[PDB]
Amino acid sequence: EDAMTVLTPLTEKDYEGLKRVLRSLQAHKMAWPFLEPVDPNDAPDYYGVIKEPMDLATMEERVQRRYYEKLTEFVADMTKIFDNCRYYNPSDSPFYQCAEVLESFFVQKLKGFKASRSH
Numbered sequence: 431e432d433a434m435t436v437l438t439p440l441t442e443k444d445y446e447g448l449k450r451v452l453r454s455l456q457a458h459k460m461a462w463p464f465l466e467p468v469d470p471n472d473a474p475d476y477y478g479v480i481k482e483p484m485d486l487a488t489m490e491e492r493v494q495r496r497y498y499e500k501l502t503e504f505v506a507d508m509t510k511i512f513d514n515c516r517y518y519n520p521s522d523s524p525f526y527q528c529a530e531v532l533e534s535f536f537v538q539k540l541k542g543f544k545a546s547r548s549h
């Protein structure tokens with residue numbers, strides 16, 4: 431990550447961009463596994479093996495409350511969603527597949543956000 435990402439405090443204009451990025455991911459066809467916290471009734475062992483769970487509704491709550499002070503912190507929460515999924519699930523599962531697709535989409539949108547910040 432460059433100078434600006436780590437170091438620049440997030441402004442109110444930055445927050446309008448982050449809201450737009452998050453809504454784009456929530457609208458993606460392969461975001462369904464990540465929209466809400468993992469239901470433990472679907473996997474009674476999940477919260478024993480994943481120590482820092484994350485999901486897009488938790489991220490939306492945090493954006494609304496202005497939790498994030500730097501872009502790096504927002505990126506770290508988003509990356510946790512995809513890394514948790516690839517550690518819990520095998521590489522041939524549809525959940526793993528969805529993480530691969532959605533992370534590539536996030537990277538495209540994040541590059542767009544960074545470009546709009548700089549000019």
Ligand SMILES: Nc1nonc1N1CCCCC1
Nearest residue numbers: 463464468472473476515525
């Ligand atoms: N929603 C998910 N995203 O990644 N992995 C997920 N799981 C939900 C189904 C049982 C536990 C694993």
